[PDB]
């Protein structure tokens, strides 16, 4: 499928998650080329992810090269691995870097690794349309060279709380309790969650999902852990069983 997701056109035939737009993982200015089992595209900011080919409730992994157009030439700033989770109203990326230019001559790549958040995005569930009793989520948290996490989340619609942890990451440190957290209104009027993170007593960062679905099936979104190396960043995705 991953193949097939750089050459075949949208088809609302495949499982949703259908598409999603790739806003936060393609810079303006910049284009970003993905490359996977003998094909590859390349994507402007604002251009869709044919996620409909992907499997659901996976990690989809393509190569990256992050790339920018200057007089006719295209000079590669980044390299590394580009991921793909895919639900059916949700979906997210993210980047593990394994190269980028030398910051002295701009024809040499360096070996550098670090792993970021991409985009996040489905179909949103509206706060003002959210359903009534409590909901159960069990899902994947993942981080760099780790896609075993577990998360388990749990919504109270009528208390309009939410709660949850993350376990089995390798890095221990990781598996840290989401703490209860308001579903309040977005800018959109979409429904989300801002949290506290916590590891025993302690804060330790924060987590923020969003609501996906018409009945809330879904939640995604990601958390940052406070670490001594320091800020980790962890991909986030559930749904109720």
Do not use: C, W
């Not at 980028?100 to 001559?105: L, N, P």
């Not at 985009?119 to 780790?146: I, M, W």
């Amino acid at each position: 499928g991953l193949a097939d997701a750089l050459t075949a056109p949208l088809d609302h035939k495949d499982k949703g998650l259908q598409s999603l737009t790739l806003d936060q993982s393609v810079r303006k200015n910049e284009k970003l080329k993905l490359a996977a089992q003998g094909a590859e595209k390349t994507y402007g900011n604002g251009d869709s992810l044919n996620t409909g080919k992907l499997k659901n409730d996976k990690v989809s992994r393509f190569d990256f090269i992050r790339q920018i157009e200057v007089d006719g030439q295209l000079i590669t700033l980044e390299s590394g691995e580009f991921q793909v989770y895919k639900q059916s109203h949700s979906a997210l990326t993210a980047f593990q870097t394994e190269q980028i230019q030398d910051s002295e001559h701009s024809g040499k790549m360096v070996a550098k690794r670090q792993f970021r958040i991409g985009d996040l995005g489905g179909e949103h569930t509206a706060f003002n349309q959210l359903p009534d009793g409590k909901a159960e989520y069990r899902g994947t948290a993942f981080g760099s060279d780790d896609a075993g996490g577990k998360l388990t989340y749990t919504i109270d619609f009528t208390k309009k709380q939410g709660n949850g942890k993350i376990e089995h990451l390798k890095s221990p440190e990781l598996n840290v309790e989401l703490a209860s957290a308001e579903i309040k209104a977005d800018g959109k009027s979409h429904a989300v969650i801002l949290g506290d993170v916590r590891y025993g007593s302690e804060e330790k960062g924060s987590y923020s999902l969003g609501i996906f679905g018409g009945r809330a099936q879904e939640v995604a979104g990601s958390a940052e852990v406070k670490t001594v190396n320091g800020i980790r960043h962890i991909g986030l995705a559930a749904k109720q069983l």
